[PDB]
Structure formats: C-alpha cells, structure tokens
Amino acid sequence: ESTEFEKNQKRYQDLISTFPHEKGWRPKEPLIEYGGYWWLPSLLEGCIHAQEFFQARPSDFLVCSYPKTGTTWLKALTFAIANRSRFDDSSNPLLKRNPHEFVPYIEIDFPFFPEVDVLKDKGNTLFSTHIPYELLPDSVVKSGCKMVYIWREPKDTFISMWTFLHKERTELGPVSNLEESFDMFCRGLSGYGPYLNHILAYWKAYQENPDRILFLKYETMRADPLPYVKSLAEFMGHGFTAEEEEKGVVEKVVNLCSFETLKNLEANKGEKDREDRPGVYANSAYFRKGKVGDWSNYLTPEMAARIDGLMEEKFKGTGLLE
Ligand SMILES: Nc1ncnc2c1ncn2[C@@H]1O[C@H](COP(=O)(O)O)[C@@H](OP(=O)(O)O)[C@H]1O
Known part of the structure; x- marks a missing residue:
C-alpha cells in the first residue's frame, strides 16, 4: 500500500540531510547542493527518486x-501536437485542465503522485523535468529518447x-526581497540553479547530438511561433501534412496553446487548482503576463547589467548568443 517513494523516503531524507545547505529564498526553506546545482529539499528527494526508479523508453x-x-507553454504545445487527431480545438482537454496535468514531471508527479492517471497509461509518451542534463536518470540518457529544451532571457526569467x-501555498515563509533574491539568482543560489549552467549543459548535449535534442528559445517562439511549432511537430514524429497546413491546423494549435487562450480559461482563474493531485500553486499562477521585456518594470539598470554581463561572460563563443 506504500508507494515506492514512500518506502524509500526516510533513506532519501537521511541521505540529503548531510548535503551542504545554504540560506534559500524563504526563511524555513534552505537550498541543498547536489551535483553542482542547488535544490529545494522536496524537489531533491524527487530527483533522487527519479534517478533510482524512473525507466525511460526510446519512444x-x-x-x-x-x-x-x-514549461507550461511547451507542455500545452506538445500535448496538443501529439493528440490533435483526437480532439477538435473546441473540445480539447487543455480547455478544462491546466497543461501540467497532461505531461507529468519525472521528479514531482512520478515520485509524489504516482497514482495519477497519466502515469498509469503506457500509451503516454510525454514527460517533463527541470533536472539538469548531467543529473538525468541514466535510463533517460541510455534510451535515446528525444528531448526539447527551452530557455529564456535571464532578467525576464528571474522576474x-x-x-x-x-x-506558492507554503508554511515555509515569505520570499526574500527583490535585491536579496536577485543577488542569490546571480550567484546561482536558486532552485535547479545555476540557471546559466543549466542552459550550458543542455546546449553542449545538443551540440553533441543535434538529432536527439531540439533547442528552443522563449522570445524567438513568442515573436514567430509557427516555424518553431512545425519544427517541434516534425521532431516529435507528428509533423503537419500539406493538407493540415492549408486547412490552418498549425494556427489552430498555436491559438489553442497561446497565453491569451490559456490565461482566460475558467479552469485557470482565481484559486482554481489541478484536479488530478494536490498543487501548491493555483492554476492562475502559471499565467502572469506573458511578455518579453517585463524585467524593466522591476529591475534597476544596475541589476540588469550585472546579469547581462554574467550571461555574456558565460556564453561568449558558445553559440548561445549567436
Ligand atoms: N501559453 C503561453 N505562452 C507564452 N507564455 C506563457 C504561456 N503560458 C505561460 N506563459 C508564461 O511563461 C512563464 C512561466 O514559465 P513556466 O511555465 O516555465 O513556469 C510566465 O511568464 P511571465 O511570468 O513573464 O508572465 C507565464 O506567464
């Protein structure tokens, strides 16, 4: 009756209890270092579990x-693309439920909510993670399963x-202030951080096996989504046919999965939360503004310049700026 995670949880807690701990973004919530990256304690226990138990397949x-x-955007797009033969845009399930219900996290849903329907359906092939490339379950890397990675301009990401x-629904306290939070972010003391190292390791992975990994960028997709959505569909093995294109299927998929559509659904308003298992966020938390450039409403020019320089120092000559 115990799940595999629950049978192993005490040993996971013992294990991580001696990993280095640093002040985090809430007073009762330290960050914990594993594999050169920093973690929330729960998410680290999920990651350890995924590493020990997650069994990826080539498909x-x-x-x-x-x-x-x-992430939420890509979840909607991937689900919509793979299932479009099943659903008209007007009766698609993304109209009634938050996209996170359709694409389970290997470090959150797999360990903590293994009884969700999607995880019991061997017909599901869609999964997500924030686990750094270097720390992915050995099954994932060995299966040869295809991956899509998205990144975003770091100022907007931080905001x-x-x-x-x-x-967040939490009793671990309020989030640190803007300046302390940003300082921590710049030092790489963030969940799944350092952000810039997270990107670079997947980028290296891509360069080594560009058939296996599709690298996307928020701002680029946001400004010109159609080519990238077509690219994604093709990479998934669900490319759009000439017939679908001329009947405007691609636009329908883009519209369905757009910020404006998703934000304005009853399912994503107010305090409404996921129906499959407990969330610590309301669905609405996932859709804030959906713009490029919102950093300028929050960060000083001095803060902006610090992170821009950090990025240009880390990525110069990698291809990521160029
Ligand atoms: N369908 C969509 N298209 C574009 N952006 C979206 C989106 N759904 C959510 N977003 C935005 O993507 C960010 C959340 O990313 P994630 O899904 O990885 O948690 C938020 O950015 P903002 O906070 O700038 O509005 C959110 O509003």
Whole structure:
C-alpha cells in the first residue's frame, strides 16, 4: 500500500540531510547542493527518486527546462501536437485542465503522485523535468529518447520566478526581497540553479547530438511561433501534412496553446487548482503576463547589467548568443 517513494523516503531524507545547505529564498526553506546545482529539499528527494526508479523508453519524449522559461507553454504545445487527431480545438482537454496535468514531471508527479492517471497509461509518451542534463536518470540518457529544451532571457526569467514565488501555498515563509533574491539568482543560489549552467549543459548535449535534442528559445517562439511549432511537430514524429497546413491546423494549435487562450480559461482563474493531485500553486499562477521585456518594470539598470554581463561572460563563443 506504500508507494515506492514512500518506502524509500526516510533513506532519501537521511541521505540529503548531510548535503551542504545554504540560506534559500524563504526563511524555513534552505537550498541543498547536489551535483553542482542547488535544490529545494522536496524537489531533491524527487530527483533522487527519479534517478533510482524512473525507466525511460526510446519512444518517450521529454520536455526539459529551467523553471519559468516556458514549461507550461511547451507542455500545452506538445500535448496538443501529439493528440490533435483526437480532439477538435473546441473540445480539447487543455480547455478544462491546466497543461501540467497532461505531461507529468519525472521528479514531482512520478515520485509524489504516482497514482495519477497519466502515469498509469503506457500509451503516454510525454514527460517533463527541470533536472539538469548531467543529473538525468541514466535510463533517460541510455534510451535515446528525444528531448526539447527551452530557455529564456535571464532578467525576464528571474522576474517570472520571483513574482511566481509570491503565489506558492507554503508554511515555509515569505520570499526574500527583490535585491536579496536577485543577488542569490546571480550567484546561482536558486532552485535547479545555476540557471546559466543549466542552459550550458543542455546546449553542449545538443551540440553533441543535434538529432536527439531540439533547442528552443522563449522570445524567438513568442515573436514567430509557427516555424518553431512545425519544427517541434516534425521532431516529435507528428509533423503537419500539406493538407493540415492549408486547412490552418498549425494556427489552430498555436491559438489553442497561446497565453491569451490559456490565461482566460475558467479552469485557470482565481484559486482554481489541478484536479488530478494536490498543487501548491493555483492554476492562475502559471499565467502572469506573458511578455518579453517585463524585467524593466522591476529591475534597476544596475541589476540588469550585472546579469547581462554574467550571461555574456558565460556564453561568449558558445553559440548561445549567436
Ligand atoms: N501559453 C503561453 N505562452 C507564452 N507564455 C506563457 C504561456 N503560458 C505561460 N506563459 C508564461 O511563461 C512563464 C512561466 O514559465 P513556466 O511555465 O516555465 O513556469 C510566465 O511568464 P511571465 O511570468 O513573464 O508572465 C507565464 O506567464
């Protein structure tokens, strides 16, 4: 009657209890270092579990991101693309439920909510994670399963994250202030951080096996979504036919999965939350503003310049700026 996670939880807690701990973004919530990256304690226990128990298949398809870079969007797009033969846009399930219900996290749903329907359906091939490339379950890497990675301009990412954290259901305390939070982010003391190292390891992975990994960028998709959605569909093995294109199927998929559509659904309003298992966020927390450039409403020019420089120092000559 205990799940596999529950049977192993005490040993996971013992294990991580001696990993280095640093002050985090809430007073009762330290960050814990594993594999050169920093973690929330729960998410680290999930990651350890995934590492020990998750069994990927070659036909699986993994959505990979650092948080707040476009994960919910990609979840909607991937689900919509793979299932479009089943559903008209007007009766698609993404109209009634938050996209996170359709694409389970290997470090959150797998360990903590293994009884969700999607995880019992061997017909499901869609999964997500924020686990850094270097720390992925050995099964994932060995299966050869295809991956899509998304990243985002770091100022907007930080602001997406800092605002979002105000909305968490938690008794571990309020989030640190803007300046302390940003300092921590810049030092790489963030969940799944350092952000810039997260990106670079997947980017290296891509360069080594560009057939296996599709690298996407929030701002690029946001400004010109059609080519990238077609690219994604093709990479998934669900490319759009000439017939679908001329009947405007691609636009229908883009519209369904758009910020404006998703934000304005009853399912995603107010305090409404997921129906499959307990969330610590309301669905609405996932849709804030959906813009490029919102950092300028929050960060000083001095803060902006610090992170821009950090990015240009880390990525110069990698191809990521170029
Ligand atoms: N369908 C969509 N299209 C574009 N952006 C979306 C989106 N759904 C959510 N977002 C935005 O993507 C960010 C969340 O990323 P994640 O899904 O990785 O947690 C938030 O950015 P903002 O906080 O800038 O509004 C959110 O509003």
